[PDB]
From a paper:
[name] ([name]) is the prototype Seadornavirus, a class of reoviruses for which there has been little structural study. Here, we report atomic cryo-EM structures of three states of [name] virions—surrounded by 120 spikes (full virions), 60 spikes (partial virions), or no spikes (cores). In the full and partial [name] virions, genomic dsRNA segments and a number of RNA-dependent RNA polymerases (RdRps, VP1) are packaged in a double-layered icosahedral capsid consisting of three proteins ([name], VP8, and VP10). The spikes protruding from the outer capsid shell are heterohexamers composed of a VP4 trimer capped by a VP9 trimer.
Immediately inside the inner capsid, RdRp is located near the fivefold vertices. Asymmetrical reconstruction focused on icosahedral vertices revealed clear density for a non-transcribing RdRp (VP1) molecule near the fivefold pore within the inner capsid shell, and nearby dsRNA is also visible at low contour levels. Compared with adjacent [name] subunits in the inner capsid, VP1 shows increased B-factors. Like other reported reovirus RdRps, the N-terminal domain and C-terminal “bracelet” domain cover the [name] RdRp “fingers–palm–thumb core”, forming a cage-like structure with four channels connected to the reaction center. Only one N-terminal tail of a VP2A subunit interacts with the C-terminal bracelet domain of RdRp, near the C5 exit channel, suggesting that [name] RdRp may be less stable within the inner shell compared with other sedoreovirus RdRps.
Residue numbers in the entry:
A (entry chain B1): 52 to 101
B (entry chain A): 705 to 955
C (entry chain B): 605 to 704
D (entry chain A): 182 to 403
E (entry chain B): 353 to 403, 433 to 453
Write the structure that this text describes.
Amino acid sequence: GEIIYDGGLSSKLADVVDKTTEPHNADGAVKDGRIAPVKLDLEKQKLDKL
Amino acid sequence: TSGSIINHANNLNKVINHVFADKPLISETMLKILTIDGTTGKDGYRNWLDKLVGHNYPVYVEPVVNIMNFISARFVADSSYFGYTNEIMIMPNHINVPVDDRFGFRDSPFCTSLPRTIMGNDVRRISYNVFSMMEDIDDVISEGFILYDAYFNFSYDIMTTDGVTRLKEDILIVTDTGNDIKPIHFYIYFENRNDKKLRYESKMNVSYRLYIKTPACLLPLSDYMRAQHDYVSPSSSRVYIKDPAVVYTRS
Amino acid sequence: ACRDKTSANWRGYSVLVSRYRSLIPNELFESLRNISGEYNINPQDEHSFFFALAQINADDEFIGAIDKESAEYLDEYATLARDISNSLTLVKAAFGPLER
Amino acid sequence: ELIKVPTIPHNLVLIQSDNGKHALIKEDLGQWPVETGISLVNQAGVFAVQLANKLGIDKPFVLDAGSNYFTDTSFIDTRKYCTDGLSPREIQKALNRQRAYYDRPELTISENKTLLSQSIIYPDADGNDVSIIFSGAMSHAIFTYAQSQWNKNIIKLDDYIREITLTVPKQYRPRRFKEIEHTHGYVYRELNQGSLLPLVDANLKESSSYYFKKLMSSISNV
Amino acid sequence: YRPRRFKEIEHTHGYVYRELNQGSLLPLVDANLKESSSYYFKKLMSSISNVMLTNRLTTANAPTVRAITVLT
């Protein structure tokens, strides 16, 4: 007979990213207008500029 | 307190830089009178602006200011006209949802109002910040919830034909830093009731659905009489004077 | 001229003093409260400082309410203190009481 | 200089299915990206400037859509059918397709006359022309409000002459006006006077030096 | 603020060495800093990056006067 339904393009809820990602803000449907997170290289094991 | 001075200085610099870029906001004669002391023109305007902080001078609300205020207020109030909403809902396909069936869309993502209670229980509400901070999103998504405390921008493409109504991108993205909601673009198709292929595809292929309040710009053809509106134009017999001077130079 | 120049360029100097205070740690500041001194300035230097008062801008340095270099310099003192304590303990354990 | 807007800026779009069973009308004002964590009123104003630019509303203007009309072939119908807005022919075609799906008969002659005469231009008591057309709610409200706000500053020539009659010096020659400009003259002028005292008080010596230099450069050549 | 998660193996079988001695700045701080204060002042100002009756004016000593103003 004719094939009424055979699978199809499927929709998945979540897009899980395996690669570890640096901290960020919302940039999808919700966009955050504030300043991006400030990266400070605190806690230096050896003195460099003091 | 310090930090207040820092904030004031930074805001002053930003304001000066923005107003002086492209076409300067201030006229050339004002720049001349401020400069006549010997300043660079930016410094004099900055000093004058700082001196005017917290004034009591009366100001007049011009017609253009009223027009902009009206348009901004209507932008804030009627959010659906400009492609953004303030709450959305995400729930599995196996839970029935009351929908706005006036238009006839198949699996319409529009609700007349967000359900206060579904299946005899209140629908959970989560702020966007708390939702992003979460780490057990699977358990809370197993039931579905209403995201709020954010402005969700969306778009839709109403297609004339019949087909499966699905988003361009996935609903959710999980990162080790946090969870985000991807941009929302609905592909809306019209509905033919007797179509086993499309019904099965909608029932089985799609596992989760996103619902937003019905846009106010959408309006059925049946109630077209509500689009009737009146505009008044002044009489064509009016003649306009470009130079309203009432006197002539002696020679 | 001096009054106009000072009224124009006081926020920058106030912010500079705030940053310089932010550089110093608390213990060193408490130590420096014991000392005292007096600075002698030539009249020509003072009149030149007030006649030609350079305008200082730190808008580039500040990212919102947070400035990086001050925090970094202040943090380095924790490493310095840890090194001080460790070295003192090691020397005392190595040499013990000292005789002359 | 007032700008005469020749056409009403409607934004109605009719979307109908291929079957024709369903149809709808949409207002197209565009999608504006709104951010979170920042105040909403500021972004609202930033977008409102662009929205006013889109509708031809920001600059001062007056409406000149009275002449956009035609008359029917039938001799009884003296009504003036306006040509602006969503044309009733489009709605007629959409409704005819919708009734064609349901196997219903097409719109009758009487129903066609009823529908095609909905948009009309009629005179008003004081001479203005009222045009009833198919248009969206947001465009209608914004256009009407802007029309009122800009009409607040249009005044008759005689009233303006009366307002500025005290300041005319004696030696200069009066200007004759055409009788039309007296009976039907209208002028767009802002009549609120902005005080210059803030600048003068804040930086007194700069303003004093500027005005004194200009005045003495003028006087020295007598 | 909460810290980012490591790898799963580093969570189940991960061990880290650490020290809990914060230390104190008193041995450096506790002294008579009268003579040595001005060198520290100069280093502090170097830490932050910066930059007829009238012809007698010269601006060759501005930075030291600025430092004096800040210290005062």
